[PDB]
Ligand binder design. Structure first.
Ligand SMILES: CCCCCCCCCCCC(=O)O
Ligand SMILES: CCCCCCCCCCCC(=O)O
Lengths: 34, 280, 177, 251, 251, 280
């Protein structure tokens, strides 16, 4: 259900994978128009 | 509420399916015009009678972080030691580029620009050509552009005043370190339509120059003959991308170039012929 | 038409007066000849798939030419149809060409389980065929043939999972530095 | 507008130049109410597995054609689930949807008459004390075409007088029945929606034909092109079908 | 009491001495919910025209019988509307109701075991690298009877070891599966009600057999009368059947 | 209150025993009818005079998680290296299935459907056939269905662009990783009564196809002769099951099949005969 998540290094690159966010569903590819 | 969903990977839900009834009207959603360069928006509940279904799939595995966040080999370096002229030979130099392994190159060349952080892991192997190996130690140093490049095993450049280095010895685990996004521009170039200041070197051979990676054996003279092979793996983090491109269809020939011609060879793709088109 | 642009179109004849078949392909998302499309290429990086599929057709002929066609989809578990009567007994759409030159049909998701293997082996997912409905009629002093085009894309319930390595590319030798 | 789209089951029909649509007698098809029911057993409703579009075999229209006619529900006697249900039960009722498609170029001319006639009882061909045989009123999906060559069993064949509506009434008064026209310069399709009409709530499906379809070329086909023969196609879709009285198969 | 009456469609079954009834796993059959559905098209429910009682061919029980077994829904592959719907579609699911009747006098003795086994995968008869053919697992309504005479195609036939449950498990542990007994001194009927069990919501009906019926005489038949051979009859009734994916007929 | 019970394993209590007195009535709980397919519900306090006893046993060890949550060997792979044609041989391929070890197979085949997560541990062993071993490194890669299968030691498929891999070297601990429930349906099949689309391959040989497991030696050419043997252990977590089945009585012969016949061999079970039934 839950889990711990602590960063130990001072650099951001040193951290792990980024948290999945969104997919930006609106696709300008399907309908390339204003 | 947020730990539970991501632990169960239940983010990025998919729309459900609604029931429909027979219809007869003037509006025809099935008809459209494809000359506009647009994609049709017809859904299954517009041309057939459907049933109410509660979908349960989630599109988390098709995200960019999941797709590009896997380790893969990008280089293999072989070093053979010689017991004659010990202080002259026994070092290697390689120029960094992600364009020498088919799988990684084809996976990353699906877009035009990208921006990410890197993670590097090394897998050293020792081959014994004598009765014993003994004690073996190795050093790897990163040389940014403009820094002096060593040309001998005992060069003064190995002191590593500011350059980053790592050490490995037999019986130790696999080394690993991280790198940030290191480019002059705001993104990486996988395709470049341009030249240099002398109107030469068409392609990406000029924009991408990240330096070199050097290695040597630190152990002094001994009486053992060995070979060292090291493999480098790379994985991307915090990924962004722009402008997708069609996938590659033929085999690669050269780095930083898109040439595909091969001497005394016909063009071969993944399409398989058929005897007749009326029989599947 | 192995290496050219002629492999993307099919020709229609006005000298045929009979309910004949034009073409037929399989509906598996990762099989030939639709394995090399965008959706087919992307699907080769995974093992399971689900959702519906959308097919579109465009008519490329003279503005004074008319035709009627029939597009049908056959669910699995039976052999491929050989006559229009058998093809009609299923999911089908009747198309009439006019000012609009594009039609779009969908292939509904019909399976026992919730997912399918992208590399099925011996199993199948059905067929789709095209037949002449009435005829192709042309006026005097007109070309007697016409062409056709086909597109494919995924509906709003398409999904993939269990990423793997693709089988549509290989490296024989070594890439020159 | 000229665009139309009809979706009955898993099938869809589109057309880009039509002339409205006809609802026979201004009544939409529906199911049977308990106020008019006679049998007491529970009816069976296949729903989407039977209320779909079925297409018959095409015919050829030339400069010397005279007409054709079909009968319902005899035409769909072997169209899958509908035919199986018709032959496995004893009673049934249903509505219908008829679509006729026939397209030509912009250098053709011609006109057709499409009509739907209830209880169309045809007449015999010869004189004396004769009647019409059973096999000649149930030709299946092929239908009947008016010709001139000699047929077998002259004492059982029906008449060929197309101009008398096959039954002794003048052509041209046929417009009272639900009908539509097909003018090659205007449209290329016709659509008629018909409910269930009868004096009884439900009836045997293999001994009674509720409706009939008639196609008559009123104006001859003429063109200067090389395509001088045009095909005609008909599609029919049952609506709100239900059956009762299950037994063994009649066949 | 000992009286029971079951009415499924237009058929009724009565018995004057039974022993309760068995509901497999304590679940009553029902339809499919939208929470578990996979296919998106609308299903077809024939209702009363298919949820009725069908009776198979009888078998003879003598003093030297050993057993019999059937498979479902293979047994009802040609029983009218159910068979037609099964062969016209691609997917389907249904429940079942099984009634077994076998009566004797008050001077007979014997016992039977009636069991219903899910996913009963039988074993081959010979050794080496062999498997079971398709035709021998689909015998229709006749079923399979264990005998001793030589059969054709020995490399495709299944085994005859009735005491090993035909698959390598000891008889007598079969009581975990839903089962009932028939003791000639107590009762003459058995009734089992079974829901739909599978790992998928719906599945192909011609390539998968969900259930199996097994009859084994545990105690030999013995009597001093002149009637030394007794028949056995089985009746099956589908419950809550529905189909999807209409196409042309497979046959 | 919840930590204490589970630490002491005092969950899943058992009912106590109540005292009884002599009775004489019309109701007879001892009599019943077994033709109904039901189990009798007679308790000890109905047919004999009992004493009030406070039971203390708990049925935690008979739970499914305890029963199926034990590691067991499922495969053994042997790899012999050859110093001639080094880049052609020296790789192994195995198809995943839990049907090759008697104990695990018989334990899991007690039900019809199951659903669980997996945990895998590897135990590599090196056999020395020369004066010394040296440095040895091994790689294991998982190949899902449809992915290219390598057929040489230096194949390009070992780059592992997306496929998961693990590395082991001499002096390192035992590798271990986890796997989720990976099936198209909602549960696993241990028994299948059906065929494929061609009416062939009766049994479970068609429904169960999880891919393959490949291995190779990464060290380059050397002068040592060795043999490598690896054992794979499996343990299940978060287990569910349905529809229990009788236990197996005879020895297994083939995978994905229930055949038991053996050439020139009589049928043998676990039942032992007696001289006479009136003497225990
Ligand atoms: C050992 C260091 C390897 C780091 C390389 C990753 C960054 C390369 C990004 C662009 C390189 C290219 O596209 O060729
Ligand atoms: C090394 C990977 C081993 C994982 C196998 C466990 C999952 C198998 C589940 C069903 C297999 C079968 O029943 O044969």
């Amino acid at each position: 259900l839950n889990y711990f998540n602590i960063n130990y290094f001072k650099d951001a690159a040193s951290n792990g994978a980024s948290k999945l966010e969104f997919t930006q569903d609106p696709s300008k590819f399907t309908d390339p128009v204003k | 509420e947020n730990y539970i969903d991501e632990v169960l990977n239940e983010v990025l839900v998919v729309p459900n399916i609604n029931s429909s009834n027979p219809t007869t009207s003037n509006s025809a959603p099935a008809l459209d015009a494809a000359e506009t360069g647009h994609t049709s928006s017809v859904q299954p509940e517009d041309v057939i009678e459907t049933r109410y279904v509660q979908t349960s799939q989630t599109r988390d595995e098709m995200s960019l972080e999941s797709f590009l966040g896997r380790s893969g080999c990008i280089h293999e370096s072989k070093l053979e030691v010689t017991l004659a002229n010990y202080n002259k030979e026994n070092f290697t130099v390689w120029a960094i580029n992600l364009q020498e392994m088919a799988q990684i190159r084809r996976k990353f060349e699906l877009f035009t620009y990208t921006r990410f952080d890197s993670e590097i892991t090394l897998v050293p192997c020792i081959s014994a050509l004598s009765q014993d190996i003994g004690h073996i130690t190795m050093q790897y140093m990163y040389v940014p552009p403009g820094a002096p490049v060593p040309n001998s095993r005992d060069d003064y450049a190995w002191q590593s005043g500011t350059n980053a280095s790592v050490f490995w010895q037999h019986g130790q685990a696999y080394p690993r370190f991280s790198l940030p996004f290191l480019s002059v521009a705001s993104a990486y170039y996988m395709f470049y339509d341009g030249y240099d200041e002398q109107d030469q070197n068409y392609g990406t051979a000029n924009t991408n120059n990240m330096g070199s990676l050097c290695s040597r054996i630190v152990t002094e003279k001994h009486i053992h003959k060995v070979h060292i092979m090291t493999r480098i793996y790379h994985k991307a983090k915090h990924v962004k991308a722009w402008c997708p491109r069609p996938p590659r269809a033929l085999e690669y020939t050269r780095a930083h170039r898109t040439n595909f011609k091969i001497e005394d060879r016909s063009i071969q793709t993944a399409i398989v012929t058929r005897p007749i088109i009326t029989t599947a | 038409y192995i290496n050219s642009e002629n492999m993307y179109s099919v020709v229609l004849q006005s000298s045929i007066n009979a309910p004949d078949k034009i073409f037929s392909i399989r509906t598996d998302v990762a099989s030939q000849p639709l394995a090399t499309t965008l959706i087919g290429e992307i699907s080769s990086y995974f093992t399971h798939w689900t959702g519906s599929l959308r097919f579109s057709f465009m008519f490329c002929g003279t503005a004074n030419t008319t035709v009627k066609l029939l597009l049908a989809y056959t669910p699995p578990g039976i052999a491929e149809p050989t006559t229009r009567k058998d093809a009609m007994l299923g999911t089908h759409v009747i198309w009439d060409v006019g000012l609009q030159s594009t039609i779009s049909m969908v292939v509904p998701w019909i399976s026992a389980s919730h997912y399918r293997n992208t590399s099925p082996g011996r199993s199948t997912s059905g067929y789709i065929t095209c037949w002449y409905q009435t005829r192709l009629v042309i006026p005097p002093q007109t070309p007697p043939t016409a062409r056709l085009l086909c597109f494919v894309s995924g509906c709003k319930d398409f999904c993939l999972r269990m990423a793997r390595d693709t089988n549509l590319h290989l490296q024989s030798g070594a890439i020159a530095q | 507008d000229r665009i139309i789209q009809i979706t009955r089951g898993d099938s869809t029909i589109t057309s880009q130049d039509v002339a409205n649509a006809i609802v026979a007698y201004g009544v939409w098809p529906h199911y049977l109410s308990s106020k008019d029911a006679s049998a007491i057993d529970k009816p069976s409703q296949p729903d989407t597995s039977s209320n779909r579009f079925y297409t018959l075999r095409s015919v050829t229209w030339s400069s010397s054609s005279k007409g054709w006619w079909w009968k319902l529900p005899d035409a769909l006697k072997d169209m899958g689930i509908f035919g199986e249900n018709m032959f496995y039960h004893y009673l049934g009722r249903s509505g219908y949807t008829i679509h006729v498609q026939c397209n030509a170029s912009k250098f053709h001319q011609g006109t057709l008459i499409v009509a739907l006639i209830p209880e169309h009882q045809i007449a015999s061909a010869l004189h004396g004390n004769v009647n019409v045989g059973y096999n000649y009123t149930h030709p299946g999906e092929t239908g009947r075409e008016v010709k001139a060559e000699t047929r077998l069993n002259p004492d059982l064949q029906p008449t060929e007088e197309y101009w008398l509506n096959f039954d002794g009434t003048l052509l041209g008064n046929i417009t009272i029945f639900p009908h539509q026209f097909i003018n090659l310069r205007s449209n290329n399709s016709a659509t008629i929606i018909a409910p269930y009409v009868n004096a009884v709530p439900m009836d045997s499906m293999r001994s009674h034909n509720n409706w009939s379809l008639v196609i008559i070329p009123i104006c001859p086909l003429e063109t200067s092109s090389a395509i001088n023969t045009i095909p005609i196609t008909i599609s029919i879709s049952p609506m709100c079908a239900e059956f009762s009285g299950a037994r063994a198969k009649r066949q």
